């Protein structure tokens, strides 16, 4: 007489009781841990969220319509985790960490949990190193430090993503260089976007030679809500690898608005009590625990950092809405973009009055502080005068056109201060507003070609000295005279 089959004992395995509303009720899995990863019979992954007395409610990372009743669920053993290392660089992956670019397996060695708690008070230290975006309007007015959290926020099609893309393209300067301290590894997390948009995005980075230091987590609109919900935390863990091992990294959640609606879907299907705009009570906790992990580590804990650039979509410029205000109260500053400025052609369209970054101001070069010290308040007062003081309008129109910048073309910090110096010091007052854009191109291509020593002294010292100031004064002055007539 043959022995009975004990392969499906309810200790380590279990069968599905029901499935339909996102959740899979599983009979068995007695030894399974809370928030543990579990594998379904169809090669699909899931998370043990609800541990009830007679069943286990499982969140299905993927299409739950593949799972049927009586399907055998199995334990992975470990808590929900993802592949982690430098092998992810130049690879596009899903929330689980599986490659979707068709370039073979990742070949990662280490792994990290998605739901790790952020560093406490002692490991942290105030931000010091500057996180250079390469955008004039950003780096001058709203600078970002390494380890800082800076919200990019605005209406649809206001140039939110373009700020993040140019920031990633700008890092090639440092990454293809000698200084290991100034390197920055990027992580672009896509939540709720189109796959075509993400495919176009990676090609743009590939053409700019930016992919080889960039990880791309992708949870697009067609993917299940749990994958969109998970995507940020997976990418965050991949960023923490660098942070903990004495390296600096950037992460872009694009966007947390589309994550919130995904988590709202799960909660409304879980039948949890809704609140403002049908969102659950822990939508703040959702983004808080994510963003807190972005921090600046002291020398005792490696001396690395993780810089976060979460994105938020506002409806009709309503910054006072529920989700924006939650993310505003987490981050260390905001960059608000307006539809009005973007429609006129003032790009990047940044609201100088509302946008702030006090934490990143401390982590800024002394050279940029000199030229763009008063510029913050000057542009704010310029927007007030809708209907001696006429000179404010004569400057405002120039500095606005001076801060305008083309797409996919960042600038070095020493290159930026040279351009801002021209307008702010009053060497472009007697000039047509339309001539400001062409002047910049001719001026910038001249100084980068001829005056390398001037730019080098500004970068090396990180300051505009008296000799550099007098030197730089006589470039813009004489170059203008030729450019005029």
């Amino acid at each position: 007489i043959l022995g009975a089959d004990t392969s499906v004992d309810l200790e380590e395995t279990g069968r599905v009781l029901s499935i339909g509303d996102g959740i899979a009720r599983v009979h068995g899995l007695r030894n399974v841990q809370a928030e543990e990863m579990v594998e379904f019979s169809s090669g699909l992954k899931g998370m043990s969220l609800n541990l009830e007395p007679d069943n286990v409610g499982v969140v299905v990372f993927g299409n739950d319509k593949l799972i049927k009743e009586g399907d055998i669920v199995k334990r992975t053993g470990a808590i929900v985790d993802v592949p982690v290392g430098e092998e992810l660089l130049g690879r596009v992956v899903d929330a689980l960490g599986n490659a979707i670019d068709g370039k073979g397996p990742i070949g990662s060695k280490a792994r990290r949990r998605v739901g790790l708690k952020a560093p406490g008070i002692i490991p942290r230290i105030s931000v010091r190193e500057p996180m250079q975006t390469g955008i004039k309007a950003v780096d001058s007015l709203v600078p970002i430090g390494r380890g800082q959290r800076e919200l990019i926020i605005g209406d649809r099609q206001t140039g939110k993503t373009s700020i993040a893309i140019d920031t990633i393209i700008n890092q090639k300067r440092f990454n293809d260089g000698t200084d290991e301290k100034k390197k920055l590894y990027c992580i672009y997390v896509a939540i709720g976007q189109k796959r075509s948009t993400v495919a176009q995005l990676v090609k743009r980075l590939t053409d700019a030679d930016a992919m080889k230091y960039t990880i791309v987590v992708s949870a697009t609109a067609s993917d299940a809500a749990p994958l969109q919900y998970l995507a940020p935390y997976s990418g965050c863990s991949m960023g923490e690898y660098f942070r903990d091992n004495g390296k600096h990294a950037l992460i872009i959640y694009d966007d947390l608005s589309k994550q919130a609606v995904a988590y709202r879907q799960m909660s409304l299907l879980l039948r949890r009590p809704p609140g403002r705009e049908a969102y659950p009570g822990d939508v703040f906790y959702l983004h808080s625990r994510l963003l807190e992990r972005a921090a600046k580590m002291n020398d005792a804990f490696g001396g690395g950092s993780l810089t976060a650039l979460p994105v938020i979509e506002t409806q009709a410029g309503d910054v006072s809405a529920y989700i924006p205000t939650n993310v505003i109260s987490i981050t260390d500053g905001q960059i608000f973009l307006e539809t009005e400025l973007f429609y006129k052609g003032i790009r990047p369209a940044i609201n100088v009055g509302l946008s702030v970054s006090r934490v990143g101001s401390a982590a800024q070069t002394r050279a940029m502080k000199q030229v763009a010290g008063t510029m913050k308040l000057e542009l704010a007062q310029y927007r007030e005068v809708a209907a001696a003081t006429q000179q404010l309008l004569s400057r405002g129109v120039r500095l606005t056109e001076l801060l305008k910048q083309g797409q996919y073309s960042p600038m070095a910090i020493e290159e930026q201060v040279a351009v801002i110096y021209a307008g702010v010091r009053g060497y472009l007052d007697k000039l047509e507003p339309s001539k400001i854009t062409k002047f910049e191109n001719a001026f910038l291509s001249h100084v980068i070609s001829q005056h390398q020593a001037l730019l080098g002294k500004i970068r090396t010292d990180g300051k505009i000295s008296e000799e550099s100031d007098a030197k730089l004064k006589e470039i813009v002055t004489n170059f203008l005279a030729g450019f005029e007539a």
Binding site: G20, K194, R195, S222, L268, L269, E277, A316
Partner: protein, 310 residues
């Protein structure tokens, strides 16, 4: 495998099975009825029972009435024989021109093209119209929001885009009538015959009509866009064409999804919409893209409720 109806509450119908429990999305043929009644499985309630959404009126159903599993989702006719014809959500012809003598069949539910299949290059679709091409041009594999109703030559613009894309790019078109007036479906059908984009005499028609108007239940109206989409997916995937998919209108697809979600008993989201608002839209709109083989450009009418874009 065979099943039995255990509960009927409006469009929602529960069906119990003995052995073979059908997966989610699968179409179920209800037996002992005059016309073809299709039930689409939505959930697995447990104890060998599944909850379904009806694609037609559920009157006349009895507890214990037999239901057969098709073994797949709602399969429909797809091919060149769909051109010039009208079909309902479940693939049956509703123009009284006999059966749609098709060669292949395709399920309405389908996974969106993978990341590797995506076209990295953004190419322009030449409509042939000067207002469009110059100021607000159409992108291949893109989705365009048409605004406005009657008194502005809406149907004439639609017919021209069908003609010009077929004339220049050699790609057929598809018109998915989603939840609008059946009167308007009759008006367009004859205008297309008058213009020439539909031809009843010979096989030179450029449009495949797929109607599921407001007279049909919310279960039907929710799956009509997918039916028309699947017809457009044939010409992309099999024939390698630049296809043109019209949806009139996208709000009714969203409304039907909200009604189906409400009837199932899911706790509603903001402004009375379903929790699965982004996913229901996402899984449909992601299938409309450019691929290695071809593309599907979509011109979708939009009714903005209360003139509120937010």
């Amino acid at each position: 495998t065979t099943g039995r109806i255990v509960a009927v509450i409006g469009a929602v119908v529960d069906v119990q099975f003995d052995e073979g429990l059908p997966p989610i999305l699968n179409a179920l043929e209800v037996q002992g009825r005059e016309t073809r009644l299709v039930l689409e499985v939505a959930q697995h309630l447990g104890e060998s029972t599944v909850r379904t959404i009806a694609m037609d009126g559920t009157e006349g159903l009895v507890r214990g009435q037999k239901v057969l599993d098709s073994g797949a989702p709602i399969r429909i006719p797809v091919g060149p024989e769909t051109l010039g014809r009208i079909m309902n959500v479940i693939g049956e012809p509703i123009d009284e021109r006999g059966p749609i003598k098709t060669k292949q069949f395709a399920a309405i539910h389908a996974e969106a093209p993978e990341f590797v299949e995506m076209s990295v290059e953004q190419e322009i679709l030449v409509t042939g119209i000067k207002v469009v091409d110059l100021l607000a041009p159409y992108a291949k594999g893109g989705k365009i929001g048409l605004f406005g109703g009657a008194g502005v030559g809406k149907t004439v613009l639609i017919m021209e885009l069908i003609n010009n894309v077929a004339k220049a790019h050699g790609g057929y078109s598809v018109f998915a009538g989603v939840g609008e007036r059946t009167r308007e479906g009759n008006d367009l059908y004859h205008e297309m015959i008058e213009s020439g984009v539909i031809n009843l005499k010979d096989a030179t028609s450029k449009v495949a009509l797929v109607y599921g108007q407001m007279n049909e239940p919310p279960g039907a109206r929710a799956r009509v866009a997918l039916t028309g989409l699947t017809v457009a997916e044939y010409f992309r995937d099999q024939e390698g064409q630049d296809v043109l998919l019209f949806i009139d209108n996208i709000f009714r697809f969203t409304q039907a999804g909200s009604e189906v979600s409400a009837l199932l008993g899911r706790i509603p989201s903001a402004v009375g919409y379903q929790p699965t608002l982004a996913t229901d839209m996402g899984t449909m709109q992601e299938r409309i893209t450019t691929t290695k083989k071809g593309s599907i450009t979509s011109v979708q009418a939009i009714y903005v409720p209360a003139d509120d874009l937010t």
